[PDB]
Paper text:
Melanoma antigens (MAGEs) are a large (>40 in humans) and highly conserved family of proteins present in all eukaryotes. Conversely, MAGE-D, -E, -F, -G, -H, -L and Necdin subfamilies are type II MAGEs that have broad expression in many tissues. Both type I and II MAGEs share a conserved domain known as the MAGE homology domain (MHD) involved in protein–protein interactions. Growing evidence suggests that MAGEs function as substrate adapters for E3 ubiquitin ligases (reviewed in Lee and Potts2).
Thus, we expressed and purified the PCF11 degron sequence fused to the MAGE-A11 MHD (S218 to C-terminus) from bacteria and solved the crystal structure to 2.2 Å. MAGE-A11 MHD formed two winged-helix motifs (WH-A and WH-B) conjugated by a linker loop, where each WH motif contains three alpha-helices and two beta-sheets. However, the extreme C-terminal residues of MAGE-A11 formed three alpha-helices, whereas these residues are unstructured in MAGE-A3-MHD and MAGE-A4-MHD structures. Of particular interest, the PCF11 degron forms a short alpha-helix that binds into a shallow cleft formed at the interface of the WH-A and WH-B motifs. I689 and L692 of PCF11 form a hydrophobic core with L273, L274, I317, M341, V337, I340, and L338 of MAGE-A11. In addition, a key polar interaction network enhances binding; R690 in PCF11 forms a water-mediated salt bridge with E266 in MAGE-A11 and is further stabilized by forming a hydrogen bond between the NE2 moiety and the backbone carbonyl of A406. Furthermore, disruption of the hydrophobic core of the MAGE-A11 SBC by I317R or M341R ablated PCF11 interaction in vitro and in cells.
Residue numbers in the entry: 680 to 697, 706 to 707, 1218 to 1424
The structure:
């Protein structure tokens, strides 16, 4: 599909409790996202001068917009943050969002970062009160085009990714629901999730996705303070 379509759908997904068009600027944002993904993989530094030279060229006057849109894509789609390390040379580095120690690449140049989807899953569990029926998780993920039993063009097979990979990584718990027979399944945060982030940091990420303040999620804000 399209990186920016999926970004738009991720912002919809986070509003579940309440479209990009093809032009030159769209192409310049995708090309920059590709360049930023290349630098992330080798922890390469990138400058504003490199971004102009290799991608922006004759759209220098749209640089602020293209960089902002590309930076939003890197975060919400790939869980990569763009951080300024030198204001004078306009030098930036690419690090994993919420400082998670996982991106699912594992020195593999096919693989797309999975930290974006991991943060969304942790968010959704949080959003449903820190324990979510499996079927409700799949319903919410359907909003961003992620489906159990279907190969996803960025993230691979989500059913295995959530119930296997992220259980073995201890980001998630996936278990039989107590009192159910025959058996239903639920997700919670795993111990690595609690060790690497907090409810309030995840609420801020969620809120920021749609330009909203965390306080505008009153129940989730109160739950995040209970920590």
């Amino acid at each position: 599909d399209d990186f920016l379509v999926v970004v738009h759908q991720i912002r919809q997904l986070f509003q579940y409790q309440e479209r990009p068009s093809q032009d030159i600027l769209h192409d310049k944002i995708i090309d920059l996202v590709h360049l930023l993904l290349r630098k992330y993989r080798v922890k390469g530094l990138i400058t504003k001068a490199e971004m102009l030279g290799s991608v922006i060229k004759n759209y220098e006057d749209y640089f602020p917009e293209i960089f902002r849109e590309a930076s939003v894509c890197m975060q919400l789609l790939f869980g990569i943050d763009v951080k300024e390390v030198d204001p004078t040379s306009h030098s930036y580095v690419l690090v994993t969002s919420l400082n998670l120690s996982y991106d699912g690449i594992q020195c593999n140049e096919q693989s797309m970062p999975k930290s974006g989807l991991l943060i969304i899953v942790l968010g959704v569990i949080f959003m449903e009160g820190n324990c979510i029926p499996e079927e409700v998780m799949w319903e919410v993920l359907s909003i961003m085009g992620v489906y159990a039993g279907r190969e996803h063009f960025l993230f691979g097979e989500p059913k295995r990714l959530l119930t296997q990979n992220w259980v073995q990584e201890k980001y998630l718990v996936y278990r039989q629901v107590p009192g159910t027979d025959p058996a239903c399944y639920e997700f919670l945060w795993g111990p690595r999730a609690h060790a690497e982030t907090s409810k309030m940091k995840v609420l801020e990420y969620i809120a920021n996705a749609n330009g909203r303040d965390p306080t505008s999620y009153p129940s989730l804000y109160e739950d995040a303070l209970r920590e």
